[PDB]
Structures are given as C-alpha cells and as structure tokens.
Amino acid sequence: SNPVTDYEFNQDQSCLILSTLKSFEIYNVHPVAHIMSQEMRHLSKVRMLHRTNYVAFVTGVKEVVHIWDDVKKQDVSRIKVDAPVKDLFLSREFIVVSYGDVISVFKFGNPWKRITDDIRFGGVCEFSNGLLVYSNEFNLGQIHITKLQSKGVLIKAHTNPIKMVRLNRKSDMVATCSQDGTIIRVFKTEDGVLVREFRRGLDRADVVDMKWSTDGSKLAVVSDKWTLHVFEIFNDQDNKRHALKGWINMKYFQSEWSLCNFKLSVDKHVRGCKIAWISESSLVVVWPHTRMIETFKVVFDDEMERWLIQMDQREQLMI
Missing domain, CATH: 2.130.10.10 (YVTN repeat-like/Quinoprotein amine dehydrogenase)
Known part of the structure; x- marks a missing residue:
C-alpha cells in the first residue's frame, strides 16, 4: 500500500x-x-x-x-x-x-x-547528451532540436500530435511517433533528414515507451496492449556474406516492420512501465505497480531466420 x-x-x-x-x-x-x-x-x-x-x-x-x-x-x-x-x-x-x-x-x-x-513548446520535450528536442507550440506534430552549450533544426515529423520523442545514446538521431499512429520515424539530429520509417501495422495500442539499444542499432517499443516490439535501424551482427551454397550474396536491409513481437505477462492492475536497454541485445522493463524488473534478451535464431525475445529474469525491487 x-x-x-x-x-x-x-x-x-x-x-x-x-x-x-x-x-x-x-x-x-x-x-x-x-x-x-x-x-x-x-x-x-x-x-x-x-x-x-x-x-x-x-x-x-x-x-x-x-x-x-x-x-x-x-x-x-x-x-x-x-x-x-x-x-x-x-x-x-x-x-x-x-x-x-x-x-x-x-x-x-x-x-x-x-x-x-525561456522556450515555448507544445507538451513534448526530451533532453539528453547536450541536445534539447521539443514540440512546437502551434504545430504539435513539429519538433525543434537545439544544442545547449551555455542554430536549431526544425522537423515536421508528424501530421498528428506527437506522442513522444526519443534521442539515441549519442544524440545523433531522434525517434518520433504520433498519437494512435501507424508510423514511427527516425531523423538525424544534425540536419533533421528522415533516416528510417517503420510501420506498426498490427499493433494498434498506444505507445507507452520507446527506447534505443546502446549502439543505436535497435529501437524497442511497448504498447498498452503490453506487447514489446523491436525495430532495426541498422544491422548489428557480424553476418554471413553468402547463402544457398555460395549462390546468393546476403544483404541485410532494414525491414519496414517490427523484427519481433513479444507479448508481456502482466496482471490486471497494470499502470504503465518504462524500458531501458542495458546492452546491444538486452533490455529491462520496470513495472511500477508490482515494483518488478524483468530482463529480456533479443536473439536471432538462424534455424528459424527470425529474431526472438526471451525473458531471462524476473525480480522485485526491494523497499
């Protein structure tokens, strides 16, 4: 209590x-x-x-x-x-x-x-690694990126109001998504050019959190349907250059959809949660209502040629 x-x-x-x-x-x-x-x-x-x-x-x-x-x-x-x-x-x-x-x-x-x-914004703002990103006051689908030393890039990211924005570790990229939006976008913070676009397709639920893997390779998203999704900005692995007995030259382009969709296990008293990558392949999910922290691992299964998410640990934050 x-x-x-x-x-x-x-x-x-x-x-x-x-x-x-x-x-x-x-x-x-x-x-x-x-x-x-x-x-x-x-x-x-x-x-x-x-x-x-x-x-x-x-x-x-x-x-x-x-x-x-x-x-x-x-x-x-x-x-x-x-x-x-x-x-x-x-x-x-x-x-x-x-x-x-x-x-x-x-x-x-x-x-x-x-x-x-003082700056005027429209409700959304993130600050990390000396970079400030904030929602425009009149156009809720537009963000402004500014460096904090002591120019300013402007991006019309979405048509609808922005749900949240997220800077990657280095702050060279920013991921955005709108309210009840089918699209997630990634822009370079330096010149605001669109670098990646992902379709959520199936998962209609509101986004609860979105975080970047430590090397900036993958983006994890959790919806309120409590499903974890991973999107790929750039291929992280050391891959094989061939397939089908040397007949094929393997290429690794970024899919427009989620690499894997994992359904989280939570009781009916869920409030929300926050996620955080702790490595290039592992991330944690913290549930405030049960004060529990789960550690997940994202792994590629060659036999299946598909990425899978597994829960390695479930422990409680002691008070």
Whole structure:
C-alpha cells in the first residue's frame, strides 16, 4: 500500500531511482541491486544525475524542484517555476524544467539561475547528451532540436500530435511517433533528414515507451496492449556474406516492420512501465505497480531466420 509515485532511469541507464509515499530508492539496473534508501514524504517526482550524490525531486508544492545531496542529506538548492513541474532533466551543466507551455534551463551550480531565455513548446520535450528536442507550440506534430552549450533544426515529423520523442545514446538521431499512429520515424539530429520509417501495422495500442539499444542499432517499443516490439535501424551482427551454397550474396536491409513481437505477462492492475536497454541485445522493463524488473534478451535464431525475445529474469525491487 506504499505505491510508487514516480520512477526514472539515470542518463546512461545503469541506475533507476524511484519514489514512494514514504521515501525514494535507487537501484543498479544490471545487475539489479538496491544501492540506497532515503526517507521523505510527498515525493511526486524524482530524478538522479549520473552516479553522483545529487538527485532532484518535487514534493507537495508542485512548482518547486529540489536539488538534493545524497550523502549530505541536504537541500543544495531550490528552484521555482510558475506552473506545476512537468518534465525534468539533469546534466552536469543544466537543469531542464518544463511547466505549462514553457521550458526553462537553469544552471546546475551557483547561482542556480536561467542560463538562457525561456522556450515555448507544445507538451513534448526530451533532453539528453547536450541536445534539447521539443514540440512546437502551434504545430504539435513539429519538433525543434537545439544544442545547449551555455542554430536549431526544425522537423515536421508528424501530421498528428506527437506522442513522444526519443534521442539515441549519442544524440545523433531522434525517434518520433504520433498519437494512435501507424508510423514511427527516425531523423538525424544534425540536419533533421528522415533516416528510417517503420510501420506498426498490427499493433494498434498506444505507445507507452520507446527506447534505443546502446549502439543505436535497435529501437524497442511497448504498447498498452503490453506487447514489446523491436525495430532495426541498422544491422548489428557480424553476418554471413553468402547463402544457398555460395549462390546468393546476403544483404541485410532494414525491414519496414517490427523484427519481433513479444507479448508481456502482466496482471490486471497494470499502470504503465518504462524500458531501458542495458546492452546491444538486452533490455529491462520496470513495472511500477508490482515494483518488478524483468530482463529480456533479443536473439536471432538462424534455424528459424527470425529474431526472438526471451525473458531471462524476473525480480522485485526491494523497499
């Protein structure tokens, strides 16, 4: 009866921070291990910075973001915005915060003030590896990519409102998808040109999460029908150059559809989930409602000439 009120992975997906009505916890994702507990109430949102002693959170007062010290159990800063905090990102340099239809970037360090003018967006925004991607305020199907040093690429990604956007590890590509959309798109963050397009076809369900494999080769998507799908941006393996006794020159082009579709096992109390690749072939799925973390492996079966997803582990995040 101590429900998770928020959970999120750290910038490199090696840790997961989570909050309850009574505290916030931090774990290592692989191998799964509880590395810290800290009492605190009213936790509404929680974030962590790499593997440092700093974390950020929102409590009762929705418009305040606390930068807190792990080892010193002390507030090292407070930052307030005009509306309840929506999105929240952290880097050794910046603190990205959105509320209402504004995105504010403060400095991560004294004097903890705006390093740049406030930006107006349409609800969607992601920040990773020094790159900021946000929904346009008037055209919800359009995104803007901007570098945060202290030009700007503009992409009309979809016709309908964007569901979510996702940057790959290096931030050189961004994946997008719209609301109840049959199409997922991948663009280069440098020039915004369309690099890949995938059709979801069969799976009609709303997308719950979308994450990139560590080398940027595969894209995993989980729908609310609770089906895991993997799309291929570029072939990852060291493949055979021939087939049919040397008669065929094997080519590996990217399919327009999912490589494999795995049906997840969940009880009727599912809220949602968040996924994260922990390698080029493995990823984890975290279920906030049962505080369980499952580790999956994506493998190619030559006998079948088909990719398969297998669940290697199911464990619970200890409180």
